[PDB]
Each structure stands twice: as C-alpha cells, then as structure tokens.
Amino acid sequence: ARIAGVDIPREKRVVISLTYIYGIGTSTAQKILEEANVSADTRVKDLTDDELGRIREVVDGYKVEGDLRRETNLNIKRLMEISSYRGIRHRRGLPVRGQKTKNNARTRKG
Amino acid sequence: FEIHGDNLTITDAIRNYIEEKIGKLERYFNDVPNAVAHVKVKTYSNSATKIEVTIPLKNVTLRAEERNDDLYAGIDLINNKLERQVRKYKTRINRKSR
Amino acid sequence: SIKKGPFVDEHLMKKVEAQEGSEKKQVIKTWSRRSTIFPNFIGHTFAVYDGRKHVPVYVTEDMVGHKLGEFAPTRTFKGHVA
Amino acid sequence: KEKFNTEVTENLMKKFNYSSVMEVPKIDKIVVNMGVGDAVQNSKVLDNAVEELELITGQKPLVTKAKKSIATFRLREGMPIGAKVTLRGERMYEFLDKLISVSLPRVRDFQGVSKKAFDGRGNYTLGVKEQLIFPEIDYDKVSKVRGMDIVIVTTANTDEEARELL
C-alpha cells in the first residue's frame, strides 16, 4: 500500500516516494523507475493506472520488506548463537572492526 | 582538578579529605569551575610531603602550595593561605563628580 | 580482506591433516591467529592461545558467524565495571 | 457467504460420527470490543471509526468494579457490538488483513469449549479501507461464537471455511 508494500506518501515526487519503503535508497529508486520509463517531474505524485502495473510489480525485484528486518534478525541471531565473540561486542557499541570506547557512551548505549 | 599523586596512590580517603576542605570555602563563593592538586614525595631524604594547589577563580585564579611532614599537615597548613590569598577582593566604591 | 583467498599457517592444517582421517580427536592446542574456520576443521576441537592460556572451543556445525582467532576477547571482564 | 456453509457443512458431517444435521455447528455471535484506561476526547474517534468499519453503531459501557488506583470510578470505557445476523455471514469474508507480518493466526486456543477464536489487532485496515489518516490506532479485541461444545470442532469448521491455523 499504496502501490507497493506499505506506507506510500501522496502527492509527492517519485524521487523520494519510492524511498520511504523499507529498503529503497536513492539510486535503486532511479533504477526501478528507469525500468518502467517513469520519472517525476517534479514534486508530486502524478500517477495514474497507466504506469501503475509496472510500479506495482517492478518493485517486487527485491526483498524491500519486513523480511529484510527478518533478514537482520535471523543474521544477528546466527551471530549470537555460536559462541559468539562479536555478539558480545554487538552490545558495547562496537562494529566488527572496533571503535575504541571512551566517548561512545553513546547512541548504541545508554 | 586532576588529583594526581606522584609516587603516592590517591585513595578515596585522601579525596574525601580534600574535597571536604574546599567545601568550607562556600563562604566565598563556589562557583566551582575546577580545582587541581599536586602532591609528591620528593626525597631529601627527609623527603617531604609536598602540596601544591591551584584555584581558578572568577576572571582570575589563585595557586597555592606548601611543604610539611605529612599529607594531612600539608593540606592543613596550605589552608589559611588560599583563603587570605582570595579574601579580599572588591568594593570599590563610587564616583565621579564630575 | 585476503587476496583470493582463504588461507592457513600450513602447520595447523598440516596437523589436522593427521587428526582428521581417523577416529577424530576432541583436543587441539594452538596459537591460531593467522588461520580461520573452514569445513575441513569440522568435528574437531580447538583451543587457541588467547595470550595467557588457551581454552576449549569445540567446532560446531555452522560456526560461520565466528572464526578461529578469537572466541573470548582478551579484554576479559570487561575491561570495565559495568 | 453461506454458499460455503453447505460445503464445509458436509466436510464436517463426514468428519465426525454425526448421524443428523442438527448436530452441526453454525455461524454464531461475533462481537467487537474496545476500551481504554480512560478517554475524554479519545472515545469519539474510536466509536466513529467503528461507525465506519461497521455501518451500525455500538454501545457505551460504564464501570462497576470500584477502581481507585488507575483512576476514579464510573469513567466510561469500552465499545461492545453484536454483529449477529447473516450480515455477520458477510463480515466473515472480510479477512483480507495481511498487514505487515500477519503469519500468526493464533492456533493458541480460545475458551476451551467451542469458541476457538482470535483476538485481533490494528485499525490500520481491516481487510479494507486503508485510511492513511489517524489520530491514533488501536488493537481490536474481537471474539467469536459457534454453537457447539468442543473447540476443535470449530477449528476444523472455520479452518475448512478458510482460516489459517499457523
């Protein structure tokens, strides 16, 4: 909903309309619209039924879904299952390369 | 203040003592931006108990030190110095005419 | 990363060569920082020298979100109170 | 619709050791319920939203159990409805409500005698009417009734009338 997935804004350009869905950025949007030969032009959702089929289906080429949230969940779940020496540093504020905690209180912690 | 101790390990006992004392200056005025303490065992070899203290003030600051036999005597002797080194300042008293 | 590609110290692998064909072992001591998991090491145990003392880690099935070089980071509780 | 009733009717009829038709379940009471800890301006958007989900109104319960810990007493709350006549038999098709991750149709059993039901969630859309204009969403407590005395009878019944178990 509207065309695809969930939570589309109305009367907004394609340039970011296709991006509020969980998994599209900015270039990938430009690709998928380039596939159905569509573009806004300029600040607004001008969409009729004409391009509606392709924008409803061409969006299906990826897992732009809560299944991507599911992808995250199952992957971190694979991490902390094993021993796991990075699921421990997954809680400190540390990615797998390290970040040297002195002023990282912080947004991955409180 | 970086209450650091050269060749003496700052306990909580020492921190408590120190901060406790400077609390008394809330008489004037605290206003607590910062404060420091340098303490050291400098062998003579009678060998010390050195105390040097720093007070940053409103629009100014006042350092203070002193040596004595032991830490507690050094903190008590250096006291009654960084009070009169502070008191007075102001007032100063109005004009011009004309 | 690595230059195409995965690798081993070529003594550890040469050891598990002797360990892995017969009735396998549940015991390997090592140092193992320049070597990492892949499906020949399965069914065995390892104990990488952390820096003070090795400690057992048994190779389980999908130990793939994980590697050989570390399993209990030598910062070791924590380093921090909280 | 009840055109399906004659289908799953006979599937159940062969299922159990029935020997006559009046031994059979039936589409019976559906009811809505809502509620709050308290509402002073909220309840209007609630029972209005219900007044669009269903094209007929609902009730306005008051309080009887002496509550003096969450708020005072007689603070109005709730909104029950009786969606009971073949209209009900048209509401039952209204399941189109895969919203976000609707994969949990809750086989976990309702009341242990011929009530196996689901207490659902989300005003966002109800298989219809994606409004995209809320002041506030709410869960939709919903129960369900069938004329029988054991729950698996209903499980088989409504499952064979296109419910998911899991």
Place this chain on the structure above:
Amino acid sequence: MKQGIHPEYHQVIFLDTTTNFKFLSGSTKTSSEMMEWEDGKEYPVIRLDISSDSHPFYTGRQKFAAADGRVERFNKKFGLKSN
C-alpha cells in the same frame, strides 16, 4: 435495525461473472489472484493487493516467493570460499 444510526455507501460497479446485478455487495480489485469478488458488504470498488490467495497464509502453504535464495548463496560461498 433502528432508523437513523445506520450509515450507507456507493462507488460504483458490480461484476462481470454473474448476472449483471449489484447485490449491495463488493467488487474487489487485485493483481496477484484477480478475482472480481462481489463479496463485500459496504462499497464495491476497492483497489487492494491480496485476495487471501497471494500469500501462503490464508489459503495455506504456497511457494509464492523465494524466500529461499539467501540460504543457498552463502552456503556454497563458505562451501567454496569464506571465513
């Protein structure tokens, strides 16, 4: 049913499968399983996504999506080369 607390509906069209009536009932637009259901109380024309047959839940199990491709990729990846 009382008179004055019951709202109603319109908009617009009925079917192409049965006799060309409108039985005060639905008209459901989908794409996955395009059934033009006249099965819906309030108002017929509706632009929806599922017919309870798209996904593998209402109808039941369906290989409607893969939903498998992730597993096999990295498996042969660390099957051949990784970690």
Place this chain on the structure above:
RNA sequence: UUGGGCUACACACGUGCUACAAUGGACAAUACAAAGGGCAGCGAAACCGCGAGGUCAAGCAAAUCCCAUAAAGUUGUUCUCAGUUCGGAUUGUAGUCUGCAACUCGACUACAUGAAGCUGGAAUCGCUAGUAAUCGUAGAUCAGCAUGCUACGGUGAAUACGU
C-alpha cells in the same frame, strides 16, 4: 621466541572534526593556483568494472614525463522549509588494496538502514588586513594507514573613537 596488550568503558577534562539547511541540499556543463615527489619510483593513454581497484604498457632521475584534477566559484534544473534529498553517526550485507597475517586492532568501495541535532544556557576563547573566515593542494612519518603536523596557494570583509 609464538600469542596477547599498550585501543577495554558508568563516566569526566582538554583539543579538534561533522551536522543542526534555502546565503542552502540533489543533479548536469564550465573557468582559475602555488608548491613539491619520483628509480625502479612516478605508472600517460587504452582496456575491465557501480567504484575501491585490476590488465597493459609510452615517457621520465626532470623547467621537460608522470604524479594531478584544483575546490570555493560560474552556468543552469530541481528540491520549496519537514527532523526535510537537512542530517550522517549506527549496524549488517557484498567487495578492493596491502600485509605471511586486517577478529581483540588497517583503510576504502557498492547496497541498505537513518541516530541525535534547528545554532547552544551561565561562563568562556582568538583576531587589526590579504588579517580573520572559508575552500583546496602537496610533503614527511610509510608494507599498509593523519578529523594530526609542516609547507603551499585560491577566495576573502566588519572593527580600531579613545585608554
């Protein structure tokens, strides 16, 4: 000698960096420097690639050849005041280089995700003209690696009564 650690974090101090936006963000075309490195190092063009990079190989111990193309800006288009195309931390996925070796502990590329934050409170710091402020450039330290240091330029004002 092999491995760890010198980098852990409830926190605090200093110092710097980056955001809190239309004087602007996104995108297309286009003009301008200084300095200085290079021997097996500088790797021209071409070729591959979403790019990091990979292939090839002309030239050159330099007024030459290469490194290396300046950014701010100018021309336009759009965005039209949102926590927004602000924002850019976070975490994962897939990769490039180096290193025998990038997990504690290298950088970078592609995809996604989008935290806080609307100019900062009391208090407090520098600066008198090409200065401040801002945008770039190279060099060392070097296998790899600078929000740092040193050096180079581009653009570029307000104030200075009086003591």
